[PDB]
Amino acid sequence: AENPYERGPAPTTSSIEASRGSFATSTVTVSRLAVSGFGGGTIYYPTSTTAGTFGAISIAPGFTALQSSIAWLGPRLASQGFVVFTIDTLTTSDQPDSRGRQLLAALDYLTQQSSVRSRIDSSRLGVVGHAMGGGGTLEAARSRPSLQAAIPLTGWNLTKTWSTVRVPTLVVGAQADTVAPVASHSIPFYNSLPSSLDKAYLELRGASHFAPNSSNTTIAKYTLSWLKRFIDNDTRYEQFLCPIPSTSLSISDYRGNCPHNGXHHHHH
Ligand SMILES: [Cl-]
Ligand SMILES: [Cl-]
Ligand SMILES: [Cl-]
Ligand SMILES: [Cl-]
Ligand SMILES: [Cl-]
Ligand SMILES: [Cl-]
Ligand SMILES: [Cl-]
Ligand SMILES: [Mg+2]
Numbered sequence: 001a002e003n004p005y006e007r008g009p010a011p012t013t014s015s016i017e018a019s020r021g022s023f024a025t026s027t028v029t030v031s032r033l034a035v036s037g038f039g040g041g042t043i044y045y046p047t048s049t050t051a052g053t054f055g056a057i058s059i060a061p062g063f064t065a066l067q068s069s070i071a072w073l074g075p076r077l078a079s080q081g082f083v084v085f086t087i088d089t090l091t092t093s094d095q096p097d098s099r100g101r102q103l104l105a106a107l108d109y110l111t112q113q114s115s116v117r118s119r120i121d122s123s124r125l126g127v128v129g130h131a132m133g134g135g136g137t138l139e140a141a142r143s144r145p146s147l148q149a150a151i152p153l154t155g156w157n158l159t160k161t162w163s164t165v166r167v168p169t170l171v172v173g174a175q176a177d178t179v180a181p182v183a184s185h186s187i188p189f190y191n192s193l194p195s196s197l198d199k200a201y202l203e204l205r206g207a208s209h210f211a212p213n214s215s216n217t218t219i220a221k222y223t224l225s226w227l228k229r230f231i232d233n234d235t236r237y238e239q240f241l242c243p244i245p246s247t248s249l250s251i252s253d254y255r256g257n258c259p260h261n262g263x264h265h266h267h268h
Contacts, residue, residue, distance in 0.1 A: 005232040007051055007081035016221040016240060021080030023048055028115055037105030039088030041067055044074035045116045046081060055124035055231035056083035058106040060099045062131025064092045069213045070130055076220050082227060083120050085110050096132050096157045100139025103127045124148055124231050130212045131180060132156045141167040149230040151223055153212040156180035160188040168198040170226040172219060174207035175252045200256030218250040
């Protein structure tokens with residue numbers, strides 16, 4: 001294809017909302033004892049060897065949480081054409097800066113040492129995270145500007161200013177979140193990102209802090225579209241991001257610049 005990184009069939013509303021994409025997937029377990037730098041995890045990967053190499057992401061949980069809290073993202077994203085590494089942290093009490101470093105240590109294990117490293121294009125990587133792990137994605141993106149995408153889900157971080165981030169970032173907030181309220185976390189994060197950066201804010205209507213821990217089609221479709229657009233440079237997914245979505249039962253607020261790779265809109 002024109003885009004060497006394009007994978008899978010042309011997307012539709014149905015395909016980006018489905019619980020699975022078109023790629024068969026498998027898993028590998030990485031034990032705590034096999035790695036240094038992070039708490040092990042689970043690799044979800046496309047099994048096909050005829051489609052080319054894939055981009056990859058690491059995903060981190062929040063304070064006290066285990067990888068089971070984010071596991072549903074594994075098959076859901078991997079089956080759309082990504083290697084997805086859901087990790088445990090060294091301790092459940094690790095703070096956002098530590099989670100950020102562990103996201104990066106996990107990506108380096110994935111691309112340099114893991115059993116699927118040959119299936120990955122190590123130049124096309126991203127980070128996703130929930131809660132303090134979402135705070136970790138901003139920490140990781142700030143440190144590693146070569147990342148292609150960063151997605152904090154209901155993120156928590158005492159640092160509110162992210163004006164040096166150069167990684168395209170989708171900030172996902174939960175409107176009713178009382179643990180990491182959007183007014184003091186997600187929205188400040190989004191507002192402090194550079195005006196020149198490809199970025200978006202997605203607010204889940206009436207959602208709690210725990211919405212990212214259960215199957216959620218709105219989180220899935222926009223996470224997928226963002227990862228496709230920026231890890232794969234896949235302009236077939238631009239249609240779902242630009243013009244920005246209108247508010248709905250699932251979406252209470254959306255902000256972002258359009259078009260990508262080139263003005264800011266906001267729907268409330
Ligand atoms: Cl539609
Ligand atoms: Cl459709
Ligand atoms: Cl491995
Ligand atoms: Cl870098
Ligand atoms: Cl700050
Ligand atoms: Cl809450
Ligand atoms: Cl909708
Ligand atoms: Mg890119």
